[PDB]
Amino acid sequence: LQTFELPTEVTGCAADISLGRALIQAWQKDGIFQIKTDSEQDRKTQEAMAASKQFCKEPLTFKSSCVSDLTYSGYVASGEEVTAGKPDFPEIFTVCKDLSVGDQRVKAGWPCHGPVPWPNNTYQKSMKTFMEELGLAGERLLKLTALGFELPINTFTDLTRDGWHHMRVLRFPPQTSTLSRGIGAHTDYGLLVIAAQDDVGGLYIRPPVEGEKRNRNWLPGESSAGMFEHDEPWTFVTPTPGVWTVFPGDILQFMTGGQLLSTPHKVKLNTRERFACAYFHEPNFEASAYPLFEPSANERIHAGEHFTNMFMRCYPDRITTQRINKENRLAH
Ligand SMILES: O=C(O)CCC(=O)C(=O)O
Ligand SMILES: [Mn+2]
């Protein structure tokens, strides 16, 4: 895979435009590239992964208490069945925008808005500072992408102001310990996905395949789930120190008219447990994404509406979903 070092500030100089061209080319050929982490980005990744490992060592009663009826942030034990001798399962802690009940959007009952049920304040601090760095990387990447497409440098800036960025903090069990098979082929609904992983290995991505029609996962009727899972090609994302991976999400596919494709990906379970984090760089919850290259187009996709429906469908029995239904929160 290509690995690039990003500049700290993207200003629009010739080097920035050149880098944007190269990022687009790498996505168009490989579906993914790596970005070099600096010493602080790396340190903060390691501290977040350590906090994740410590949290997963807590008893299940405690982990299961890290839930909220206002936000989807918090813990889920994935799956619905276990057996004797296969008692383990994937675990996710989702971090969405951390808004207290003092925030006006929370007071107004906006769906998905509320405070993260942090397990402790060291996990909180570790995840917040990691997500701050991930957000800055996302902004650099979007400015470079704009420059590479000959668009204004700040094309994405209003769209992502106070963006609804969120992250899944993941633990996958060893294959022999679980009835889970990992995560099947899917795409992520976001502008960009920035991901980190430990040394165990398990992530596979599907590059662009010339002539291969792709479902447009921003449309409810074109779910990408499961598609191509058993068909070649799948690229193994070899664990590599000192990098994050980056691929386009569904929103960038929409905005670019398919010049970038949302990268399908899947996770296979290994012989050891595996830790990873997947960060989703997003528009503002209230913003609508639009075609960048079709100025006459009136079609839009509303980020907040899609986020809410996706979480409601993925976690239909969570207290968060029950409260959305009880209070008819979709009406906001
Ligand atoms: O486990 C990984 O490396 C990626 C996980 C993922 O794709 C997700 O949480 O959407
Ligand atoms: Mn994913």
Numbering used by the authors: 4 to 335
Wording from the paper:
Third, we focused on the nearly inactive Y306A variant of the EFE for which the substitution occurs distant from the active site. We noted distinct behavior when investigating the MLCT transitions associated with Y306A EFE·Fe(II)·2OG and obtained insights from the structure of the Y306A EFE·Mn(II)·2OG complex that was crystallized in the presence of unbound l-Arg. Y306 is a generally conserved residue located 12 Å from the metal site, with the active site residue Y192 located in between. The substitution by alanine of Y306 in the EFE, a residue 12 Å away from the catalytic metal center, generates an interior cavity that leads to multiple local and distal structural changes that reduce l-Arg binding and significantly reduce the enzyme activity. Substitution of Y306 by alanine leads to a large conformational change of one loop with additional propagated changes to affect several residues important for l-Arg binding, accounting for the inactivity of this variant. UV–vis and structural studies both reveal that 2OG binds to the protein to yield a mixture of the monodentate- and bidentate-coordinated species. The loss of the MLCT transitions upon addition of l-Arg is consistent with a deficiency in l-Arg binding as revealed by its absence of this amino acid in the crystal structure despite being present in the crystallization buffer. In line with experimental studies, the binding energy calculated from the MD simulations using MMGBSA revealed a lower binding affinity of l-Arg in the Y306A variant enzyme.
The ethylene-forming enzyme (EFE) is an Fe(II), 2-oxoglutarate (2OG), and l-arginine (l-Arg)-dependent oxygenase that either forms ethylene and three CO2/bicarbonate from 2OG or couples the decarboxylation of 2OG to C5 hydroxylation of l-Arg. l-Arg binds with C5 toward the metal center, causing 2OG to change from monodentate to chelate metal interaction and OD1 to OD2 switch of D191 metal coordination. The best characterized EFE is that from the Pseudomonas savastanoi (formerly Pseudomonas syringae) pv phaseolicola strain PK2, for which several crystal structures have been reported. This enzyme binds mononuclear Fe(II) using three side chains (H189, D191, and H268) with three water molecules completing the six-coordinate geometry. Here, we extend our understanding of EFE catalysis by carrying out biochemical, structural, and computational studies of the enzyme in complex with a substrate analogue and using two enzyme variants. In combination, the results presented here are compatible with the currently proposed enzyme mechanism,4−8 emphasize the necessity for OD2 of D191 to coordinate the metal, and highlight the importance of the second coordination sphere and longer range interactions in promoting EFE activity.
